[PDB]
C-alpha cells in the first residue's frame, strides 16, 4: 500500500482560495468514500476538518470543502485567513483495516510584513564561571521571514567551534525566533577584548557585543 502523496508546500493570498491535492490509488481513494483531512498548528493535536470525502464535523467553517476525482482527493480553502496557516494532512481507509496518511502540506498565507530580528546577547553568569564554565547566549526574535544566519567573533576574528544554534520557530505573533550558544573556557572569556554575536537577516546584519567586566 503506497503512501498518499501531497505537495509539500502551498501558498495563497488573504481572501483568495487554495486547493491541496492528495493522490492515492484506485483501491483506496478511488474505491472508498473514506477520505479525511486534518489541520495541525505548531505543537497542537491535529483537528478533523473533513471526513467522508465531503463532510464537515461540528463547528468547522464552510470555507473548508473536500472532493475527489479518480484516485485524487482535494481540500479547498476559500476566504483565506492568516489563522488558516497550518500543516494539512489527508488520510484514507485502506483494505486490511488500516488508514493511510499523506506526507502533509504546509500552507503559507502571503502578505505578512517583514520584520527585523531583535537581538539580546548575554555574558557568562558569575555562578557559571564559579563552576569553571562559560556560556554566551544570543537570543533572536520577532523576525520575518524565518531565515537567519549567525556569526560569532572573538574580538573581531571569526569563531565556529563551541557554537550550537537552533533552527527558527514560529512565535504567537507569526514572527520567528532562534537562539545561539557559545561555549567557552573562563580563560578565553577573560582573555579577550569583547565577544560579539552578529545576526544576518535577509541582507542586513544586526550585531550585539559583551565584554568581560
Amino acid at each position: 500500500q503506497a503512501a498518499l502523496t501531497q505537495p509539500p508546500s502551498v501558498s495563497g493570498s488573504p481572501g483568495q482560495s487554495v486547493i491541496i491535492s492528495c493522490t492515492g490509488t484506485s483501491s483506496d481513494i478511488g474505491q472508498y468514500n473514506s477520505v479525511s483531512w486534518y489541520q495541525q498548528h505548531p505543537d497542537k493535536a491535529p483537528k478533523l476538518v473533513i471526513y467522508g470525502v465531503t463532510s464537515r464535523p461540528s463547528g468547522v467553517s464552510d470555507r473548508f470543502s473536500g472532493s475527489k476525482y479518480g484516485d485524487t482527493a482535494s481540500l479547498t480553502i476559500s476566504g483565506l485567513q492568516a489563522e488558516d496557516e497550518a500543516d494539512y494532512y489527508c488520510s484514507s481507509h485502506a483494505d486490511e483495516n488500516m488508514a493511510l496518511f499523506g506526507g502533509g502540506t504546509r500552507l503559507t498565507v502571503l502578505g505578512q510584513p517583514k520584520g527585523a530580528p531583535s537581538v539580546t546577547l548575554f555574558p557568562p553568569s558569575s555562578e557559571e564561571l564559579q563552576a569553571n564554565k562559560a556560556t554566551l547566549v544570543c537570543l533572536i526574535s520577532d523576525f520575518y521571514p524565518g531565515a537567519v544566519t549567525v556569526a560569532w567573533k572573538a574580538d573581531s576574528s571569526p569563531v565556529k567551534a563551541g557554537v550550537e544554534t537552533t533552527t527558527p520557530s514560529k512565535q504567537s505573533n507569526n514572527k520567528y525566533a532562534a537562539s545561539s550558544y557559545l561555549s567557552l573556557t573562563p580563560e578565553q572569556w577573560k582573555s579577550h577584548r569583547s565577544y560579539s554575536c552578529q545576526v544576518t537577516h535577509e541582507g542586513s546584519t544586526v550585531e550585539k557585543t559583551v565584554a568581560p567586566t
Binding site: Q1, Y32, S34, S36, Y38, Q40, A45, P46, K47, L48, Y51, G52, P57, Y89, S91, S92, H93, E96, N97, M98, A99, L100, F101, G102, G103, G104, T120, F122, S125, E127, E128, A131, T135, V137, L139, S141, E164, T165, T166, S169, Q171, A177, A178, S179, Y181
Partner: protein, 220 residues
C-alpha cells in the same frame, strides 16, 4: 463529554518496550468506538499506528508495526493502551490517543477527538536535571533571564513570578548539543527603574528529574 488523556514514561531504553495508556472519561471503553493511536516524530509527519474496537477488543496495527505492537483496553480503569516492543531511536515521537467518530465505517480514519499528545524519547542516556543560571541585566527598559543548561530529556517548563509576569517574556526552544544534552533560555524585558525593588523569579521545572527551581535574578 469524552476526554482523552495520555499517560506514561517519557524515556524508554533501547530494546525495552514503550508503554502508554489513554484514560477515557465521559463514555465507556466498551462502546462501539475505534480507540486509535497516532505518533509524530517532531518536525515530521503523522503516522497511523492502529486501533482497538470497543465492543470486541479486536485490534489492528499498520503493516510496519504489526510485529512489535499491541493495542488493548483496560476494562477496570476505562483505558486503552499501546505497547511497542524492541524500542529504538525511530520510535522517539509525540504520541496521540484519539477517538473515531461514532458508527462510521473506518472510524479509525475519521478522528475528531484527540488527546494532548505525549513526547517519549528513546535513548540509553540517563535522566539529568538542569543547572539554572541567572542572566543579570546591565533605554528605559532592561533584559534579564534564566539559563537552563544541560538537561535530559525533554521537556522543561519556564515561568516568571509563578505566572504573574507575562508581558515581555520570551521562552526559547531548546538547543540539542553534541553532548546529547539540552539547553534553553528565557528572557523578559522590564522597566529599568524597577530593578532592585521588584523581585524577579525564574521558575524552572524538569519533571523527568523531579527538579524544581525558583531562581532569583538580581542586578549588579
Amino acid at each position: 463529554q469524552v476526554q482523552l488523556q495520555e499517560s506514561g514514561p517519557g524515556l524508554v531504553k533501547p530494546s525495552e518496550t514503550l508503554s502508554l495508556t489513554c484514560a477515557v472519561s465521559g463514555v465507556s471503553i466498551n462502546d462501539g468506538y475505534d480507540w486509535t493511536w497516532i505518533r509524530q516524530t517532531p518536525g515530521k509527519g503523522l503516522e497511523w499506528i492502529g486501533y482497538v474496537f470497543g465492543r470486541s477488543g479486536n485490534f489492528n496495527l499498520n503493516p510496519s508495526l504489526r510485529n512489535r505492537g499491541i493495542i488493548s483496553k483496560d476494562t477496570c480503569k476505562n483505558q486503552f493502551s499501546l505497547n511497542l516492543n524492541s524500542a529504538t531511536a525511530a520510535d522517539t515521537a509525540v504520541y496521540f490517543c484519539a477517538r473515531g467518530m461514532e458508527g462510521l465505517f473506518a472510524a479509525y480514519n475519521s478522528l475528531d477527538v484527540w488527546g494532548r499528545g505525549l513526547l517519549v524519547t528513546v535513548s540509553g542516556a540517563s535522566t539529568k536535571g538542569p543547572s539554572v543560571f541567572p542572566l543579570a541585566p546591565s533605554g528605559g527598559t532592561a533584559a534579564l533571564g534564566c539559563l537552563v543548561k544541560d538537561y535530559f530529556p525533554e521537556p522543561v517548563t519556564v515561568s516568571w513570578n509563578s505566572g504573574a509576569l507575562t508581558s515581555g517574556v520570551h521562552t526559547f526552544p531548546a538547543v540539542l548539543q553534541s553532548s546529547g544534552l539540552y539547553s534553553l533560555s528565557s528572557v523578559v524585558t522590564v522597566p529599568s527603574s524597577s530593578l532592585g525593588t521588584q523581585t524577579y523569579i525564574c521558575n524552572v521545572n524538569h519533571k523527568p528529574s523531579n527538579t524544581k527551581v525558583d531562581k532569583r535574578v538580581e542586578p549588579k
